[PDB]
Amino acid sequence: AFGINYMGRVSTSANNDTQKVWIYNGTATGSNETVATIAASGYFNAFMVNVALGKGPLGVGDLIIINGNDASAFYTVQTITPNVTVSVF
């Protein structure tokens, strides 16, 4: 249940030779899901244009500030193909 309206950029730099920082909602005002649900494999697949070839805004190593309806934590993108998987940080 990824919602593009709840994803936002944090890092202001356009330098694509370094990693980006994202922030995702998920509280009662956002997608209203737990951190464990959001951190599940392939949850952010709908964000990528074509996840099979790894084409999309997310890149390996980006930091996502996940804000679930129970808690919040930093996460780091590990792979973008064939699924978008994240690990805690």
């Binding site: 202001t12 730099s13 356009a14 330098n15 694509n16 030779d17 370094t18």
Partner: protein
């Protein structure tokens, strides 16, 4: 004084900060005055 730095391409600019300060001059008033009585006009060879 300003300063020039480097940055990565497409990165946001990070200015080097320029300091400012102020200087204050205090104004004073001075007077130089004299009197010349009219009875001395006809008694002096100079113009008082």
């Amino acid at each position: 004084e300003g300063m020039a730095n480097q940055k990565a391409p497409q990165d946001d600019i990070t200015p080097m900060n320029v300091s400012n300060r102020d200087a204050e001059a205090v104004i004073e008033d001075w007077y130089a005055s004299e009197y010349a009585d009219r009875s001395f006009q006809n008694k002096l060879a100079v113009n008082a």
